[PDB]
Write a protein that holds these residues in place. Sequence first.
Motif, short mmCIF file in Angstrom:
data_model
loop_
_atom_site.label_atom_id
_atom_site.label_comp_id
_atom_site.label_asym_id
_atom_site.label_seq_id
_atom_site.Cartn_x
_atom_site.Cartn_y
_atom_site.Cartn_z
N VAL A 1 0.83 -1.20 0.00
CA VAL A 1 0.00 0.00 0.00
C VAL A 1 0.87 1.26 0.00
O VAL A 1 0.55 2.24 -0.67
N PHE A 2 1.99 1.22 0.71
CA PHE A 2 2.94 2.33 0.70
C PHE A 2 3.43 2.61 -0.73
O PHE A 2 3.53 3.77 -1.15
N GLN A 3 3.73 1.55 -1.46
CA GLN A 3 4.29 1.70 -2.80
C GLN A 3 3.25 2.09 -3.84
O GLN A 3 3.51 2.97 -4.67
N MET A 4 2.08 1.47 -3.81
CA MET A 4 1.10 1.57 -4.90
C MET A 4 -0.19 2.30 -4.52
O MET A 4 -1.01 2.60 -5.39
N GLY A 5 -0.39 2.53 -3.23
CA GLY A 5 -1.62 3.16 -2.78
C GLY A 5 -2.75 2.19 -2.44
O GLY A 5 -2.80 1.07 -2.95
N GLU A 6 -3.66 2.66 -1.59
CA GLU A 6 -4.81 1.87 -1.14
C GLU A 6 -5.63 1.30 -2.30
O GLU A 6 -5.91 0.09 -2.35
N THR A 7 -6.02 2.16 -3.24
CA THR A 7 -6.87 1.74 -4.35
C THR A 7 -6.22 0.67 -5.22
O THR A 7 -6.86 -0.30 -5.63
#
Length: 162
Positions: free
Chosen positions: A103-109
Amino acid sequence: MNIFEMLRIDEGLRLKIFKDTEGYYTIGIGHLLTKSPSLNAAKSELDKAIGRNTNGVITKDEAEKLFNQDVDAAVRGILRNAKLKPVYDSLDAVRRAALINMVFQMGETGVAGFTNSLRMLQQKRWDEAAVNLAKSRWYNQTPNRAKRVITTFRTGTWDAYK
């Protein structure tokens, strides 16, 4: 090993605005500033984030502050998301770190869209989840980092970071 040390390994530390693996302006420990091609736009985001007129350069303390906020934001994003929260809750501490890393790298969505991978993780079919996770743009564009994160999901250990 912990999520902060894990992400420091994966992201590194740079104190001047640079471009990330996708060509996007970034600073510190993987702090995305903007997807805009405009450096001026990136500098404005930086000033707003730090709360002062920067020269496109920040201190280590400032980088670490953004990092704390960004790790916090990744966990908050997981917990507010109807797809990610049950998977997170189902996981052990080490694999929880692996999900925060994604999630840090690519985001929640972005991560919430890994529907089949998430299901295999919730089922604790670790080798199958690992195989499925690698069938991704994520894996192809950052394979060494994805391999580490996937090994963490596969094994529930920190072997890929030691």
